[PDB]
Every structure is written in C-alpha cells, then in structure tokens.
C-alpha cells in the first residue's frame, strides 16, 4: 500500500490521474519522480522547467555539475539525481523529441529505464512540447513498464482523451 490518491487504474501496474506532477510530488513525496529531460539536462520548459522551478533552481545547479562531469545523456537514456524538495530521487529520462527530429522508436528504450525502480510518479514521456502522439506513448508505457507507475497528466482535455481511447 502506497499513498497515491484518486488514480484511475489502467492495468495491473499503471495508474493515471489528471494532475500537476509538481503538485503530486509535493503531496506524496514519492521515492522517485520522473523528469521529462533532454540530454543536456537543461530544464527550460514543460515538466522539466516546472519541476526545476519548484526546486528553486537547485535541480538545474545539480544537473549542470552532473553534465560538466559526465557529458550529455543519450536519447532513450536516464540518470538518477536528487529529488530535492519533491521526492527522494529524480529519474531524468530522455524520450525522443519529435520537434527536434529524434527517433520516435527510442520511446520504448526511454520507458525501459522505469523498470529499474519499483514505484514511480511520472509524466507521459514525449508528450506535450516533445511532440509525440500521447496515445502511442501510453501504449508504449503499458507495454514496456513492469514496475508500478503512477502517471500524472497535466492537460485535462488530454487526460479525458487518453482514458476514453485506452484499449
Ligand atoms: O501531461 C501533460 O499534459 C503533458 C506533460 N506536461 C506536463 O506535465 C507539464 N507541462 C508544462 N507545464 C507543467 N507544469 C506542471 C506540469 C507541466 C508533458 C509530458 C512529457 C513531456 C512534456 Cl514537455 C510535458
């Protein structure tokens, strides 16, 4: 038993809510919150900019030190950093950004990173300003992640569309 609340059950292990992931994180303090990152960990907008803003830019400061030491991530890859005031850990996961011309086939690889953590609060990878089809991303999530994932969908209209079309 965990302390996520009001989540619609999609499958054995995937639950979904129309909620601001930043607000969910502040309320639950999960072990792992997933950031929809880019390879440079430049947290400008979307999930990343919003999470980072909620940490008072501490996420960005930590991320810049990480990149200075390790170089960029791979598209499809991830790293574990602090969750600051939002969670124990933040799993920064790089899905493909369609508006950058990146390979949508890498979405499955991106979701595979979730399997290294027993429970996660997460956004829908490559949705929003990443420009991929959110219905497809949800299908990849359910068909790839085996651990317990709680998806927080910001856009109300998107949430309703995702629920009503889910097979
Ligand atoms: O679920 C959605 O609607 C799509 C979701 N977006 C957000 O979670 C979001 N976007 C902008 N500002 C925000 N502030 C608090 C949350 C938040 C998303 C998912 C993957 C990549 C990106 Cl880039 C965006």
Instruction: Quote the Cα angle for 15-17-23, to 5°.
Output: 120
DSSP string, the chain: -----SPEE-SSSEEEEES-HHHHHHHH--SEEEEE--TT----SHHHHHHHHHTTTHHHHHHHHHHHHH-PPPTT-EEEEE-TTT-SEEEEE----GGGT--GGGHHHHHHGGGGSSEEEE--TT-GGG---HHHHHHHHHHH--SEEEEEE--HHHHHHHHHH--
CB 125 within 8 A of CB 110: yes
Order the strands of the 8-9 sheet from edge to edge. Answer: 8-9, 14-18, 148-153, 119-122, 32-36, 89-93, 78-82
CB atoms within 10 A of CB 160: 12
Q: Whose CA is nearest to atom 22 of ligand 1?
A: 128
Distances (CA, A) of 127 to 5, 124, 136: 23, 6, 9
Experimental method: X-ray
User: What is the token pair recorded at 110?
Assistant: 């991106």
Resolution in A: 1.0
Question: Which residue has a Cα nearest atom 1 of ligand 1?
Answer: 153
Residues having CB closer than 6 A to ligand 1 are 20-22, 36, 46-47, 50, 123-125, 127-130, 153-155, 158
Residues 6+ positions from 44 with CB-CB distance below 8 Å: none
Tokens (6 digits) for 84: 């600051």
Q: Where are the domains of the chain?
A: 8-163
Closest to 132 in 3D by CA, of 103, 91, 164: 103
Give helix 46-54 / helix 58-70 axis angle, nearest 10°.
120
Give the Cα separation of 159 and 17 in Å (integer): 7
- Check whether domain 8-163 has CATH 3.30.420.40, yes or no: no
- Is beta strand 89-93 parallel, antiparallel or unpaired with respect to 32-36? parallel
Ligand 1 pocket test: pick from 48, 123, 159 the residue with the most ligand atoms within 8 Å of its Cβ: 123
Cα angle for residues 81, 87, 93 (degrees, 5° grid): 45
Q: How far apart are CA 92 and CA 78, in angstroms?
A: 5
Find, among 113, 105, 148, 141, the residue nearest to 125 by Cα.
Answer: 141
CA distance 158 to 150: 16
């Amino acid at each position: 038993v965990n302390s996520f609340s009001g989540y619609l059950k999609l499958t054995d292990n995937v639950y979904i809510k129309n909620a601001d992931i930043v607000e969910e994180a502040k309320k639950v303090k999960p072990t792992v919150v997933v950031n929809a990152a880019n390879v440079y960990l430049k947290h400008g907008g979307g999930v990343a900019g919003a999470l980072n803003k909620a940490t008072n830019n501490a996420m960005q400061v930590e991320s810049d030190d990480y990149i200075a030491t390790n170089g960029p991530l791979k598209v499809g890859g991830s790293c574990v950093l602090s969750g600051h005031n939002l969670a124990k850990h933040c799993l920064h996961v790089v899905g493909p950004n369609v508006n950058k011309g990146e390979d949508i086939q890498l979405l499955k690889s991106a979701y595979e990173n979730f399997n290294q953590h027993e429970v996660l609060l997460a956004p829908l990878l490559s949705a929003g300003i990443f420009g991929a089809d959110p219905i497809h991303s949800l299908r990849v999530c359910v068909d790839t992640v085996r651990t317990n994932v709680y998806l927080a969908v910001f856009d109300k209209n998107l949430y309703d569309k995702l629920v009503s079309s889910f097979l």
